[PDB]
């Protein structure tokens, strides 16, 4: 037994879905092809790729899925670009220009005030 999760690109884009079987170690009681066996269960109906990308729909255990040029794919999420800093005991980098940037932050302050007449 186990839970079954359905990975859905929005339906206003695509009607393809992929399905994850929580405790199946492929040994699956449904279908085959496009089978990616991972620690989060068997993901059937998605193409595993050797690329990495930013996470879109998270699955678990390092794996995210997305809809790309079309099919649903499974991939290891990337944690970001690499940056090797030229550290040296006699070298300093100093800015010569600047940018004034404005960003936004949104916070809730209040919720709807409700009341209930129990009778």
């Amino acid at each position: 037994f186990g839970g079954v999760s359905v990975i859905t690109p929005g339906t206003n884009t695509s009607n393809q879905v992929a399905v994850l079987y929580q405790d199946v170690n492929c040994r699956v009681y449904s279908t085959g092809s496009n089978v990616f066996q991972t620690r989060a269960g068997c993901l059937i109906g998605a193409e595993h790729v050797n690329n990495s990308y930013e996470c879109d729909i998270p699955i678990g255990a390092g794996i995210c899925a997305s809809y790309q040029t079309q099919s649903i794919i499974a991939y290891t999420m990337s944690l970001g670009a690499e940056n090797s800093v030229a550290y040296s005991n006699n070298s300093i980098a100093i800015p010569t220009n600047f940018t004034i940037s404005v960003t936004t932050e949104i916070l809730p302050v209040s919720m709807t005030k409700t009341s209930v007449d129990c009778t």
Binding site: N90, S91, T103, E105, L107, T114, C118
Partner: protein, 211 residues
């Protein structure tokens, strides 16, 4: 950006959606039988006589009470989360809007300069104005300059050098200046500091003393 992206205000929309779902779940529990012959009290009363009618009512009555207590508990927990957000928002307005904060990445990413609040349904939106360094260049450095055997440290800036000359500059924006006694200060000899370099510190009085 706000006009273009519909997800931009998802944090406020989510609050609205959660509260709507709670109310739209509570009213649906009224359709439940909870083991009673009918979800409707009027049907129980029009068809059953008191020795049995009260028994059926007594199931619905605990069913409905359970739904209300569940609702209230969830609203209390959710309210606590909103309060925490409100406390943070108030803190930010005092520290980001009515001041200049030095807390890193608290009032936006980058060095904070100022911010402006804007209102929104059920919340507050802040526009955080920050300074972001750009276009850095690589320079050679040293902790001190050795002049006449005495060690000179910068008063505020950092000693840097291009291929032929040493300068002292402010750390966050390159602006090289002559290394002088008004830009540096002296402490200790040219021995204890590791990486001290051979250079000349300009004396601003000398030419006036001679003229």
């Amino acid at each position: 950006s706000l006009s273009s992206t519909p997800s931009a205000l998802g944090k406020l929309q989510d609050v609205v959606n959660q509260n709507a779902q709670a109310l739209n779940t509570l009213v649906k529990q009224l359709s439940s039988n909870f083991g009673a012959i009918s979800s409707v009290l009027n049907d129980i009363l029009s068809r059953l006589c008191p020795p049995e009618a009260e028994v059926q009512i007594d199931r619905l009555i605990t069913g409905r009470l359970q739904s209300l207590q569940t609702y209230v508990t969830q609203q209390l927990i959710r309210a606590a989360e909103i309060r925490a957000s409100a406390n943070l928002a108030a803190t930010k307005m005092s520290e980001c809007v009515l001041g200049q904060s030095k807390r890193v990445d608290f009032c936006g990413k980058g060095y904070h300069l100022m911010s402006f609040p804007q209102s929104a349904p059920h919340g507050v939106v802040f526009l955080h104005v920050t300074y972001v360094p750009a276009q850095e260049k690589n320079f050679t450095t040293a902790p001190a300059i050795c002049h006449d055997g005495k060690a000179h440290f910068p008063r505020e800036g950092v000693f840097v050098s291009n291929g032929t000359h040493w300068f002292v500059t402010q750390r966050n924006f390159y602006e090289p200046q002559i290394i002088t006694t008004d830009n540096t200060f002296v402490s200790g000899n040219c021995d204890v500091v590791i990486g001290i370099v051979n250079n000349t510190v300009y004396d601003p009085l000398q030419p006036e003393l001679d003229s």
